[PDB]
Ligand binder design. Sequence first.
Ligand SMILES: *C(N)CNC(=O)[C@H](CC(C)C)N[C@@H](c1ccc(-c2ccc(S(N)(=O)=O)cc2)cc1)C(F)(F)F
Length: 215
Amino acid sequence: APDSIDYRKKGYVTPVKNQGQCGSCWAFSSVGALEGQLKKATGALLNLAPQNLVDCVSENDGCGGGYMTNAFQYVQRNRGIDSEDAYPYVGQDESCMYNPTGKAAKCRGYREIPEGNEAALKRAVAAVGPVSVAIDASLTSFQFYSAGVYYDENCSSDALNHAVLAVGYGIQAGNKHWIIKNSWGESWGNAGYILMARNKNNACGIANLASFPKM
Ligand SMILES: *C(N)CNC(=O)[C@H](CC(C)C)N[C@@H](c1ccc(-c2ccc(S(N)(=O)=O)cc2)cc1)C(F)(F)F
């Protein structure tokens, strides 16, 4: 397994999106992982529809929140998910309006990373590509982030409240990190991205609820 990798340089990651005033972070984390798998399997990078997930996953709560595992299971049972063009993101809860003519990808299940194992999460990123992860993003230091490797001793490993995408890992000035793609727009952080502490006792619970789709 490599010491460092950035999937953005391989063309596996789509531009940073903005979820707006809707707790649909799980939907953006889900499509991000599916977009990476679609690019590996077909060679084409396309924007998938998070709105398709907020409106249709009955096991989730739409703009009220949800889980990535439930999103993947829906895509599997539905035998598809729409592209962003075929099902536009509006940031609100609406009825399921899935269009089969706009289908851009599907998945055949998911696999979870062993709880709390950052080494297993590292091997998963190196071998499969972008992985959906859950973190504690409640702190003020997270909201106002800009440059450097993020670490805060007050970050909880048990209070998971946000979903993001791990697109790689590296080392910045002696500190090991995870390249994290957020869904709060380009005005946030470092052009929508955040470098989170790697191998610092599972900081912010980064390896507590990680998963990737199977194609
Ligand atoms: C992102 N913008 C908001 N955060 C979340 O959605 C987080 C995500 C990570 C994975 C922790 N999840 C929430 C959450 C999970 C589940 C529900 C929920 C689902 C389904 C129902 S229903 N429709 O059956 O009544 C109700 C609630 C809400 C939020 C949390 F709480 F952090 F675990």
